[PDB]
Design a protein around this nucleic acid. Structure first.
Ligand SMILES: Nc1ncnc2c1ncn2[C@@H]1O[C@H](COP(=O)(O)OP(=O)(O)O)[C@@H](O)[C@H]1O
Ligand SMILES: [Al+3]
Ligand SMILES: [Cl-]
Ligand SMILES: [Cl-]
Ligand SMILES: [Cl-]
Ligand SMILES: [F-]
Ligand SMILES: [F-]
Ligand SMILES: [F-]
Ligand SMILES: [F-]
Ligand SMILES: [Mg+2]
Length: 454
RNA sequence: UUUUUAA
């Protein structure tokens, strides 16, 4: 395609020969690297090849049709590129299993080559089309397993066909800060039926709609970012609220804003120290830029207990995080195992694979991963760890554990095996004065509400 | 059993 640089922006125009998904031009990494005027995303092209050909050489998607600021161009390119390559990656892996057989002894073995008419899986990997589809779209031999059930990677790919390629100019207020500090409370307190609430997290959506109804008697419908990107916005919007905004790449947020076209402003609420977006290819991310025109910070939690605040303040928030919660009972460590969950406890674990056995172990209880719980408040958390090893989700710096510990406003049980390195920190949280007064919180909050409403 | 997420 053609690439221009009208001062001081970048414009890519696709030509009739070009491979295009919606408004995004599909380019090979080398084509990007040959182009001097695309040098602002050469790090992206290099990162695409380093995680594809070595692990063609992948693809780089670029927004076309509009003069875009360089920073937005970078963000939109990187975000759309990750979606495209993740779909290719998953499908290529499935294609490898179907043609070369599974790699033992991995989870590749849990896939089954089956005839499309003899399976009951709703979605299916079609070996002739080289993509995942509904079972009734496939004819003959198909591969069936967890990545095809459902094929999120295909859903996200199809969403690229409607992804905006030109940022929407509007005020973007960021409210960032520590867990439990009232970022989501702001959305629940200010949302009107003329607004749109989105969330980077699915369970957080239901928490919002329920809390707005219970607290303000107002029926709203919060949607995930993915739901909006994958399904569009078919009504005018005054304020766009994005909760758990740091779970999404900046270019995804730009695409969401241009899809919604809010008439007044955008408010992003989030915490970069909690779970973000992961790339299954673990590509180095270069262009997750700040897109806010104003940024406010919250350092005082209302939810998190003193023992938990002491731990995550020290690990993740440079000791600046405090809490107004007076709960200071010790965290219960169970390696024996001497404990059972009480009614109302949220049962949490870091691994999706362990959720199955825990649901059986604790029928009637809420059970989910730490990552899926992000944004929720619970009276008690019953965390279970089935195995102790060097998995990064349980590392000391893990954002997953950060989220897990900060879900409770009171009791926390950590059920694990002896030798769990986390036991030391849990039974001996860092010392310090991590307590704040309610009015310190109120004056911090007032500064943010003054700026949001200004 | 390495984590988001559509209808
Ligand atoms: N005045 C208040 N404003 C906000 N939250 C409050 C207030 N009083 C008590 N809380 C409690 O603090 C918690 C704040 O959590 P939330 O808004 O979900 O935090 P975040 O979205 O910042 O993680 C809620 O469970 C709420 O019940
Ligand atoms: Al929170
Ligand atoms: Cl950190
Ligand atoms: Cl409190
Ligand atoms: Cl106490
Ligand atoms: F939080
Ligand atoms: F939070
Ligand atoms: F939260
Ligand atoms: F939150
Ligand atoms: Mg929240």
């Amino acid at each position: 395609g053609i690439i221009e640089t009208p001062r001081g922006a970048i414009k890519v125009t696709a030509q009739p020969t070009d491979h295009v998904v919606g408004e995004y031009l599909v380019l090979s990494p080398q084509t990007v690297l040959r182009s001097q005027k695309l040098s602002l995303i050469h790090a992206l092209a290099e990162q695409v090849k380093t995680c594809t050909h070595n692990g063609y050489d992948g693809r780089v998607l670029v927004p076309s049709g509009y003069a875009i600021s360089p920073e937005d161009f970078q963000s939109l390119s990187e975000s759309a590129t990750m979606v495209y390559n993740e779909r290719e990656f998953v499908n290529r892996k499935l294609h490898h299993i179907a043609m070369h057989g599974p790699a033992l002894n991995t989870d590749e073995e849990s896939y089954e080559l089956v005839r499309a008419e003899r399976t009951e899986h709703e979605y299916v990997y079609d070996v002739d089309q080289r993509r995942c589809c509904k079972k009734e779209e496939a004819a003959g031999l198909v591969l069936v397993g967890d990545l095809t059930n459902p094929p999120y990677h295909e859903f996200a790919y199809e969403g690229l066909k409607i992804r905006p390629a030109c940022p929407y100019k509007i005020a973007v207020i960021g409210v960032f800060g520590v867990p439990g500090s009232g970022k989501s409370a702001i959305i629940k307190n200010l949302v009107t039926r003329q607004d749109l609430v989105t969330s980077g997290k699915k369970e957080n959506c239901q928490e919002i709609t329920t809390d707005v109804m219970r607290q303000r008697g107002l029926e709203i419908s919060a949607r995930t970012v993915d739901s909006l990107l994958l399904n569009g916005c078919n009504r005018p919007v005054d304020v766009l609220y994005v909760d758990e905004a740091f779970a999404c790449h900046s270019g995804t947020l730009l695409a969401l804003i241009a899809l919604v076209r809010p008439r007044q402003k955008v408010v992003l609420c989030g915490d970069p120290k909690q779970c973000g977006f992961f790339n299954m290819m673990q590509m180095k991310v270069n262009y997750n830029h700040n897109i806010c025109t104003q940024v406010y910070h919250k350092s005082i939690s209302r939810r998190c207990t003193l023992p938990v605040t002491a731990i995550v303040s020290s690990l993740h928030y440079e000791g600046k995080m405090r809490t107004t919660n007076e709960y200071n009972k010790p965290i219960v460590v169970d390696t024996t195992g001497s404990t059972k969950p009480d009614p109302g406890d949220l049962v949490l674990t870091c691994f999706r694979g362990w959720v199955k056995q825990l649901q059986i172990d604790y029928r009637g209880y809420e059970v989910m991963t730490a990552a899926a719980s992000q944004g929720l408040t619970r009276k008690g958390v019953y965390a279970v760890r089935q195995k102790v090893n060097e998995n990064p989700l349980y590392a000391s710096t893990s954002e997953h554990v950060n989220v897990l510990l900060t879900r409770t406003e009171g009791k926390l049980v950590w059920k694990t095996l002896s030798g769990d390195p986390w036991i030391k920190t849990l039974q001996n949280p860092p010392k310090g004065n991590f307590k704040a007064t309610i009015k310190e919180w109120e004056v911090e909050h007032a500064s943010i509400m003054a700026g949001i409403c200004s």
